[model samples]
Target chain A: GAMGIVGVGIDLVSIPDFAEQVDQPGTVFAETFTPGERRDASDKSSSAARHLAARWAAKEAVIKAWSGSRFAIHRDIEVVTRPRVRLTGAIAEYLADVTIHVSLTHEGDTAAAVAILEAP
Target chain B: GAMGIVGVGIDLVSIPDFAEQVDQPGTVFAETFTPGERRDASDKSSSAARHLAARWAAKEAVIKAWSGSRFAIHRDIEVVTRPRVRLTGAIAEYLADVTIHVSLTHEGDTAAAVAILEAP
Candidate 1:
């Protein structure tokens, strides 16, 4: 097999604070999440903000797993549920042969995500 | 190729708070990290506490990635240099065919880690 474990990235977010930026059009929320991603959160009812916040962490985690410098755009890492990671843009430019795994959690007031990259 | 990703776990710690527990022999730091682990941090000089804090996060992250129940002991997961994950005890009871990946980071005041599991 190729190198088994290439890299891993971990990230956490404060939901209450995340919700603030998510609602602000002036922030990068528009470019941070795709329309489908926003739709996924919209379907969550009262927990929509938290769900999106978790996705935000997932996006950040992916970049970290990729070494934090490879990904230049946020919209490329579209996080959708059942909670899956979809890569676009320059995400494939690096780690093309690597398998990406992402897990997300939403606790009382925090959102956490982990991304692991494997190649073989 | 086997299933690429089996699990991923994320965890974070407060450096100042973790530093306190790490110095207390009565605390679980004894059970949380092995002697070799302490030696690894000791070799880190001024950043020793931060390094151990990151290891604490790695251990917790492993349990979280294991879905929070499979791991029975903290000592079962060992964080080592260049930074790697070593499993002992019942750690093999699950994910026997899995490849584990770990990454740790220590910012100014926080320590973070991500664990990813892959099966083949």
Candidate 2:
């Protein structure tokens, strides 16, 4: 099945910029990411802030690539459980036709992620 | 068809840092980009360097996402010819099973890109 790419999203965040805003167990991190996500960030062994920042960027990237209605909540994107991710909410249903392919990376002072939405 | 992601690559370049290496119509730009690309950059009105830097990152991103051998030639990634991209040489054939999705962004001091390899 040679499904074609539907849309692509790219997101980048400054680690220091994100680290200042993140509270590990709370803050925007609490509001934007799921409960399990917060727990993992707190439990993460190394560069937890960088990983969370990358995830945050991934969520933003998804919304940028989303072809659905303009309205999208942070909760609509999920990726804390695995380095991988999925979609939920109206956005998820809106994109039911395609599967999500996500990749995240953090280096130097930046964290970045890519979201690819593809379908036949 | 529900396609899964084969591999993902993310690359970021410091805009000005790259600007130092980029001499436009020539220099690293001439060596890395095709003649047509160099012409396009010169013809571009503004922020041309930013676009080219993003393409540089895009090329590296594709190489990272290549599912084939570790060896990847930069000339294989073609673009800036729009904002879209395609692959060539061994890397393209190595990823024949999947299609490529590329996204690029330039902001403040850096340019970033993502390359996704996906298959059904």
Candidate 3:
């Protein structure tokens, strides 16, 4: 059954964690992000913390979708945030990249993203 | 007016791009991606190429959102695919993470996704 069990499942990130980061002033944001992303994260006012947290959680959730595969979670998989979240770095170093199939969302204090990873 | 121009606009990827990747047998996807991602990419059918291409495009679109800032598209940003897409590597290493505020979808050869990034 090529289409039977297809790919991986869901992963999630917590909004509270993001709140903790922004609450602090000198969080060294970029080394953790790219220049353009930093601009996006810092440019907003109303939902800043929640937005950042949702981005982080989205990336983490995507990583989790790779279960039962050649990758490991703590391998420093480059996690990213933006319109969507992407990962690379150590994680990509040892495996072929997967493509996102679809995504589901939940509205929370921050934000949450879930992805469906499939063969590309 | 903090809410005047807010952040950025939307970016898109053509389904043709993904078709090109899958057309080839050994495209070196990860290095290009992470392990979990590789598993996901190689595990689907009927829409694999279109899916990967869409995921790639979504990340690029997110990158575009960061325009007028510090990140450059060719800077080798780490990308991961799953239920959603996330970026890291050179991109995240330089900026702060932004979250997905909301998302919209389009149905085509591959499923296309549009997301809104907000400050976190």
Candidate 4:
């Protein structure tokens, strides 16, 4: 089937932290994500706000485990299975060949998720 | 810092099948999943229907690689992170201690997800 597989890792964050962050109305979009990510995560119809954020954090964690970046994590990137969270803008040009596997969940005031990518 | 992970796999299904099955009204919940799955997947405020279905399929596929199920796949199980997709009922009693990593997405007519579970 010409499929590629990746190693997986998981992490979780307190929902209370998310609520506190969301409270600063002015910083709602700014604190949780990059401008592009905030737009997609905050749709009114679903709990995507938390789901997207969970995956976003998981992506950073995945990138850390994969690339071993200590700081300079790219928060602009996100995982969208339908659109398949492609590399875009300047970031897209870097990891264009990589495919990230993501699973996410958020409830009450906490969120958690896992990320997977091909091992070198 | 404590965490668990599983192998990863992704899958998708035709929305038409879901829509057709849903149109039957009487059979809306029957054909796509078990009774419990149908209830969990069909949340009124979220697109959990398709999200849960994609995950359901991914779980089966992951199980095949892990447990090698040629048939008799259990459809009554589901994943919930806040509640953490714990096993319940008769199914819960068997798959105790196993954790399934799950991600779900459904837009318009399609649904998709990825499941990662720790290797035994």
Candidate 5:
């Protein structure tokens, strides 16, 4: 069977607002992101906010492309490091047999992502 | 052969700045977009700026996804209405056998677009 595009989603985040949340000294980061994602952002240092914001947009866009169902835990749509994006729990079943491709970019105080969902 | 992702590009435009340009009495609108695109924008009325800006970003993203070579005429990458997007002249040759999918969105003062190019 040939693969076909099921849906597409895009999102944008304000870099300054996201940076403030990350610096608030709380679970704002931990509650929403995985340890690996946190590490990737931490490694980026001064540019961490933009990186994190883009990742946030990527996760949101992925879920939006899927069906926009409310999940108890947002981490169910974790953005893993290349080739292995994690879709755990009910969200995984919701997107059954679908493969998602995402691209992230940031420039001029804004971060953006695009998600393309495909299935056979 | 299964269709595979070739490249992805995303772009954002400042809606206010774009709106200003469109309001100008000059040929800023006519010089770049097709008749169909112009009519689409005109029909959008008060929301025309964001709509036009989204189309502009979509065109830029599609060109960026396709190797970013400079074209003699910018109008070669016109955004047609649904199902069939226009790619003419040398730009079409540059994309070759690839099929491009584009998604456009606008909110606040920003208009964004994402382009996905795929080939077998």
Candidate 6:
């Protein structure tokens, strides 16, 4: 049993601040988030900004946790309901066996996310 | 090699709101937090509230991650610089094999924490 913790990352964002960014009608959302994530956030009647911010935080946290190789936040990390994080590019080969775990939360005007990468 | 994420928890708190609770003339801090945590907060010339709120959220996140245990947060889970989390009391045995990992962050008026429990 030579197991241990690998990578850890946490991020926090203000909902109101992020709302303005996402609502500006640009490709930032499309460029950074997956189609499914955008659809889910867009479907929210009132909490779309909160959802987007939470997911954005999640991507940032995962990128921070991923110490192996650098990947595009939107292109590589496909965060669906269960978070299918695939490492691509040069670093992907080195970290192919790693598993990623993510958690997201938002309360009041703040949204936070955490990501953990583990290896066995 | 059978390994996966066991439990995960994330929590967010308003620093100003929690600061009020810790500054109030009562033993709420004593009843909920360890002496070391209290001392650490007391020693800070400024940003004590941020420190206290971050630790409080850390404890809450750890408790949420410990799915098998119903132990008292203040008594069982200790929040230090590295966060030494112990499973004590009735549910300790069930989760003794699990290793705990934690990360904390604070920004603006919000504090957030995330905890993960792993087993092999």
What is the TM-score of each predicted model, taking all chains together?
Answer: 0.54, 0.55, 0.34, 0.40, 0.55, 0.60
Among all windows of 10 consecutive residues in model 5 chain B, the one with the lowest summed lDDT is B66-75
Q: What is the CAPRI rating of model 4's predicted complex?
A: incorrect
The candidate that wins on DockQ is: 2
Per-residue lDDT over A88-117 for candidate 2, one digit per residue giving the tens place of the 0 to 100 score: 787667777767777788887777877766
Scanning candidate 5 chain A in windows of ten residues, the lowest lDDT window is A64-73
Q: Candidate 4, residues B1-120: lDDT per residue as tens digits?
A: 233333444444444454334333456246445666565555533465555556544554344323422123344455553224545476565556545665556565555555555523
C-alpha RMSD of each candidate structure in angstroms: 7.9, 7.4, 19.2, 11.9, 7.5, 6.6
- Give the DockQ-based CAPRI class for model 2: acceptable
Instruction: Predict model 6's lDDT versus the native.
Output: 0.68
**Candidate achieving higher DockQ, 1 or 5:** 5
* Models sorted by DockQ, best on top: 2, 6, 5, 1, 4, 3
Q: For model 2, what is the error of residue A81's alpha carbon versus the real structure, in angstroms, after optimal superposition?
A: 2.7
lDDT of 1 by residue, B1-120 (tens): 434566777787887776555644555776776665555454433487777888788878877878743333656677776357777877756656677777776545667887767765
Give fnat of each prediction, in order: 0.22, 0.51, 0.00, 0.02, 0.24, 0.34
Scored against the native two-chain complex, candidate 2 gets a DockQ of: 0.27
**Cα lDDT of model 1 by residue, A78-100, tens digit:** 88875788778776566567778
The regions of model 5 sitting more than 4 angstroms off are: A20-47, A68-75, A82-84, B1-11, B25-52, B59-100, B106-109, B116-120
lDDT of 3 by residue, A17-63 (tens): 55444443445444455554554454333355455655565555555
Question: Which ranges in model 4 have alpha carbons more than 4 Å from their true place?
Answer: A1-8, A22-49, A69-76, A81-83, B1-120
- CAPRI class assigned to model 3: incorrect
Q: Model 1, residue A82: what's the lDDT? A: 56
Residue-by-residue lDDT tens digits, candidate 5, A42-110 = 543347666778878788677666652222256677775442368788778877777788887788677
Better of 3 and 4 by TM-score: 4
Q: How many steric overlaps does candidate 3 have?
A: 29
Interface RMSD of 5: 3.9
Residue A33: error of model 3 in Å? Answer: 4.3
Instruction: Report how far residue A95 has shifted in candidate 4, in Å.
Output: 1.9
